[PDB]
From a paper:
To gain insight into the structural nature of binary complex formation and disassembly by NSF, we prepared a complex of NSF, ɑ-SNAP, and the binary t-SNARE complex (21bin20S) composed of full-length soluble SNAP-25 and soluble syntaxin-1a (1–267) in the absence of divalent cation (i.e., non-hydrolyzing conditions) and performed single-particle cryo-EM. First, models of the NSF D1 and D2 domains with substrate bound in the D1 pore were built into two high-resolution (2.88 Å, 2.92 Å) classes from a single dataset, differing only in the state of F protomer engagement with substrate. Next, the dataset from which they were derived was combined with two additional datasets to enable the 3D reconstruction of weakly populated states with ordered density for the ɑ-SNAP—SNARE spire. Classes with evidence of NSF D1 domains engaging ordered ɑ-SNAP—SNARE sub-complexes were carried forward; eight 21bin20S models were built into reconstructions ranging from 3.39–4.01 Å in resolution, differing mainly in the orientation of N domains and a sub-complex of three ɑ-SNAP molecules and four SNARE motifs relative to the D1 ATPase ring. All classes revealed substrate-bound NSF without Mg2+ needed for ATP hydrolysis and disassembly, and share the same overall architecture, with a spire composed of NSF N-domains and the ɑ-SNAP—SNARE subcomplex on top, the NSF D1 ring in the middle tier, and the NSF D2 ring forming the bottom tier. As such, the stoichiometry of the syntaxin—SNAP-25 complex observed is 2:1, the dominant species in solution. Three ɑ-SNAP molecules bind the 2:1 binary SNARE complex; a flexible linker between SNAP-25 SN1 and SN2 blocks access by a fourth. Of the eight 21bin20S classes with the 2:1 binary SNARE complex from the dataset collected under non-hydrolyzing conditions, six engage syntaxin and two engage SNAP-25 within the pore of the D1 ring. Docking the 2:1 binary complex structure back into the seven individual 21bin20S reconstructions reveals an apparent preference for syntaxin, with six of eight reconstructions featuring the N-terminus of syntaxin H3 bound within the pore of the D1 ring. Taken together, we observe that the NSF D1 ring can bind to at least two different SNAREs, syntaxin, and SNAP-25, in various configurations.
Residue numbers in the entry:
A (entry chain B): 1 to 153
B (entry chain H): 41 to 82, 130 to 204
C (entry chain I): 148 to 286
D (entry chain J): 0 to 24, 38 to 288
E (entry chain K): 0 to 23, 36 to 286
F (entry chain G): 188 to 259
G (entry chain L): 197 to 259
Write the structure that this text describes.
Amino acid sequence: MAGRSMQAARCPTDELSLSNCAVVSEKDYQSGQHVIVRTSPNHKYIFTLRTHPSVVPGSVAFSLPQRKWAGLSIGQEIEVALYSFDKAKQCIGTMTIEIDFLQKKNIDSNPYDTDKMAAEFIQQFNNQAFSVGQQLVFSFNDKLFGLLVKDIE
Amino acid sequence: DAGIRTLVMLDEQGEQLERIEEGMDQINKDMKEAEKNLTDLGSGGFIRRVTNDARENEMDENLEQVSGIIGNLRHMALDMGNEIDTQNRQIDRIMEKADSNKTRIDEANQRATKMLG
Amino acid sequence: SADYYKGEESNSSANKCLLKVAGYAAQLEQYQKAIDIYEQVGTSAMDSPLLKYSAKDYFFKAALCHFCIDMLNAKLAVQKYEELFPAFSDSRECKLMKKLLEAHEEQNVDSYTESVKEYDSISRLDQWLTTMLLRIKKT
Amino acid sequence: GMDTSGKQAEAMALLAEAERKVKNSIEEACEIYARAANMFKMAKNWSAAGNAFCQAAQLHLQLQSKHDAATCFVDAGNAFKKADPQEAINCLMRAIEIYTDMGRFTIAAKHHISIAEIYETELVDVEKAIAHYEQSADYYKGEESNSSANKCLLKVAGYAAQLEQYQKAIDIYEQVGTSAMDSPLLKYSAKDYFFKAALCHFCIDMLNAKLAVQKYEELFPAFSDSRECKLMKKLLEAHEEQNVDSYTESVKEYDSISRLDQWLTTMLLRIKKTIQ
Amino acid sequence: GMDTSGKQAEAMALLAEAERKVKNSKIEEACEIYARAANMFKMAKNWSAAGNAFCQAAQLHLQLQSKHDAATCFVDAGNAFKKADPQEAINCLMRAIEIYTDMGRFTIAAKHHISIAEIYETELVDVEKAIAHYEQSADYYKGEESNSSANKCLLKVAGYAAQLEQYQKAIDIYEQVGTSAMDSPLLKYSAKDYFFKAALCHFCIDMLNAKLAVQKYEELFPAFSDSRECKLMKKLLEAHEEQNVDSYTESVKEYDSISRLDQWLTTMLLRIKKT
Amino acid sequence: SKQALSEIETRHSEIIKLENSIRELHDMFMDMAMLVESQGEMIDRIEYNVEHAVDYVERAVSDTKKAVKYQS
Amino acid sequence: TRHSEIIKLENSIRELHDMFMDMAMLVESQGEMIDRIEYNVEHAVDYVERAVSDTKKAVKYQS
C-alpha cells in the first residue's frame, strides 16, 4: 500500500500491449488492480494492473505507448503503490479524444463507424485509468490508431 | 607583469630558504658541540579575404600576439614551476632537521634534569 | 642596507635596493647615478633566467633616463642597448621609443602624444614613467 | 578492529593509574593522562579525550607551567572540534586568553581565525564570526600582516552587505580599493571593489549611487573605460524611468558576457525588488 | 671496477672491528660504530647486506636506552631494504610506525604508511592491502586535519577502486572531494573533473540513470555545462542510446584530437563503449 | 550573402569562449601572485625569527664556553 | 590553417591550466607546511629558552 520498488520490464504479449494495460507478474499484484507508478517526485502515472504468468516476479511490464506517454525505459526502476478509484467522483462520463495513425505506411481514408469505435474503446478499456493528454494505441478493425486523450467529463 | 613578479618573488624565497637551512645546520652543530663539552665537564594563415575582410586584419595581429604570448608563457610557466618542487623538498629536509634538533634539545634538557636526581 | 647585505653575502636584496634607490634618485633629476645603477642591475639580471626577461624593463628605464641627455647619443644608446640584448627588439618599448624619436626629430608633438595615448590605453603607465614622458614632452 | 578496543583499554588503565597517582599526593600523572588521551584519540572515540586532556593541562598548570598546558588545551579543543563544539570553543577561548597573557599576537590571531571558521561552519552565527574576524584582522595589522587583515576585513564587509546595512560594507570596500590603487599588483581588483560599492550604493538610493560612481570615475580615470562603470551608468539610467525590462536585458547580457559570483545576482535582484 | 671491491673491503673491515669492539658503556660505542659500519656498507652499494647490517645495528640500538635514534635507524633500514626483500622493509617500517604512534607522531607515521603502501603496490601485486594502508593514512590525516594529504589519499584510493571495478566507492569519494572543493573559494573549477570521473563511474553501471546523473551534475553546477566534459558526456549518451558504432568512435576521435587521454580514462571509456 | 554571414557568425562564435578562457587564466595569475606574496612575507618573518634564535644560541654557546673554561 | 592554430591554442591552454592547478595544490600544501613550521620553531625556541634559563639560574644558585 505504501509503495514498493519495482523494475520496469518489456510487455509480455502484444495483445496486452494493444489493450494498453500495465502487465505485471502474479506474485507482484493481482489482475485488474489499480496502481500509481512513481518515476520521480513529480511523475506519477495511474495504471490498471493485468497479471500474466510469463512476467518474471518482481518486475512490472510496460508497453511501447505507455513508455512514450510516461517516458519509461526498459529495465527502469520505479515505485508502485496500490490505489482505489473514487467512483463517486472519478467515473468518466464522456471522452473527447483525438486519433493519429501510429504507422504512416498503411494510412487509409476508409470510413470508420465512430459508434463501434467508442463501444470497442469502452469494452477494451472498461474499469481502466485514463487521464487528459494520455497517449495509447487502439486497435479497431484490425487497424492501429494512436489515440491522444484530449478531454474527459 | 604578474608572471614576472611571481618569478622574482620565488627566486627571493628560494634564497631565503637556503639561508634558513644553513642557519639550522649551524645551530645543530654548535648545540651538539656544547652538549658534548658540558658532558665532558664532569607556414599557415590567420587571414581570410572572402568579402574584402577589412575588419579581420586587426584581429589577426591581436591573435598573433596572443598566440606568441601564450607560447612564451608556456615556457615561462614551466620555468617558474620548476623551482617550487625543489623548494618543497628543501622544506621537507628542514622539517626533518628541525624535528631532530628539537628532540636533541629536549633530550639534553631531560638528561640535565635527570643528572641531579 | 645594501652594503650590509653585500657584506653578509645575502644576495637577491641588494639588486632590489639599488633598483629602488635609482628609481628614487631619478626623481631628483640626477641621471648619472640612476644610469649607473640601472645598467648594473640590468647586467646583473641578464644572466639570471628568472630575471633575464625582466631585465628588458630595466634597460627601458635606463634608456628613458638616458633619453634626456641628448638625442644624438640616445639613439646610439638605444642602438647599443639593442646590440647587447638583441631580444630587446621583441619588446614593444624599442619601437615605442623609435616612433617617439621620429616624432621629436621634427618637433611633431602630435605623433608622440598619439603614441603615448595608445601605450597608456593598451597598458597603464607608472607615475615615474609618466613624469619622464611629460618632461621629454617639455623639450 | 582490535585496535580500537586495545586503545580504549589502555586509555582506561592509564586514567586509573593517573587518578591513583594524584590521589596519593607530579609530572608523571600529567604524562600518563596525556598518553591515555593520545590512545583515546587513536581509538577514534573523539569524545571523552577532551576531559583527559583538560585534566592533564590543569595538572601541568598546577606547577606554574603555561606553554605545555596551552598546547594541550589547543589539542583538546581540536579534539572537541567535531565531538562537541561547545567545549572546543571554550578551550580555544582559554588558549586565546593564555596567549594574550604571554603576549603571543600571532597565535592569538590564528586562534581567533579558527574560532571564526568553526562558528561559520559548525554553529549558526555571523555576528560572532564577524567580531572574531575583525579582532584577528586588528591583531595581524598590529603584526604588520596587512594581507590577512585586509582579507578578514573584506570578508566582514561581504557578510555585512549580505545581511547588515551597507555603510560598513561601503566604507570597507572604498578603503580597500583606495589601498589597492597604490599597490601595483592588486590595483586592478580595485575595480571589482568599486563595482561592489557602486552596486551597494544602488540599493541605498539612485542619486547617491550616481554621485558615488561619478566620484569613482573621477578618482580612477580608467574606471571610465571599465565595463562595470558603463553597466552601472546604463542601469541607473534605466531604473530612473522605472523600466524593469531594460534592467533584465542588461543583467542577462552582463551574465552572458561573463559569469557571476552568485552574490552579484542576489544584489541585482534585491535592487530590482524596489524598482516597481 | 676496483672502487666497489675497495668499498666492500672497507665496510666489512669496519663491521668486523665493530664486532670486536662490542665483544670486548660499551653498548653506546658498539652501536655508534655499528651505525658507521652500516653507513659504509650502504656506500659500498651491496644493498641487501647493507640493509641487513643496518637493521641489526638498529636492533642493537633498541637494546640501548634510546627511542628516537632507534626509530631513525629503523626508517633508514627500511629505506635500505626498499631495494631488497620488501617483507623486511615492511616489518621494519611497521615497527617504526608503531613506535611513532606510541609517541603520538601522526605525520611521520602516515608518511611511512603511504610509503609502505606504495612499495607494496609498485613491487608486489597485492594492492588491496595497500588500499587498507591508504585508508588508514587518510583517516590519520583527517584526524590531524591535513587536508592535502587526506585528499591525495582519498583520490588515490578512489582511482584504485575505479580500476578494480569498485565503482560506488570511487563515485562517493569523487563527489565528496568535488563538493569540498566547490565549497572552498578555490579549487571549484577542478570539481568538473571529479564530476566527470564520477559520472563515468555511474555510466559504467547503467545508461538509463546516466540521464538522471547528468541532470544532477548540470543543475547542481550550471557552469559545468561550459566544460567540454559535459558535451562529451551528452554526446556519448546520445551515441550509446542507439546501436550506431560511428557516433562514439567519432566522438572519441574529436575529444582525443585536442588532448591525449590518460590510460585509466582511455580504458574506462573503451570498456563502457564496448558494453 | 545570407549563407556567408551565417558562416561569419559561426566563426565568431568561438571568440567569446576563447576570451572567457583567457580571462580565466588571467584570474588564476592574479590569485597566484597573491599567494606568492603571502608566502614571501611569511618566509621573511620566519627568517627573522631564525636570526633571533641563532643569535641567542650563539650567545648561550659563548656563555657556556666561558663557564666551562673558568670552572675547569 | 584555422583548425591547426585553434587546436594548438586549445592544447596550450589545457597544459597551462593543468600545470597551474598542479602548482596551486603544491603551493597550498607548502603554505600549510610553513604555517606548521612557524609554530613548531616557535615552540622549540621557547622550550630551549626555558631550559637554558633554568640551567643558568641553577648554576648561579649553586655557584
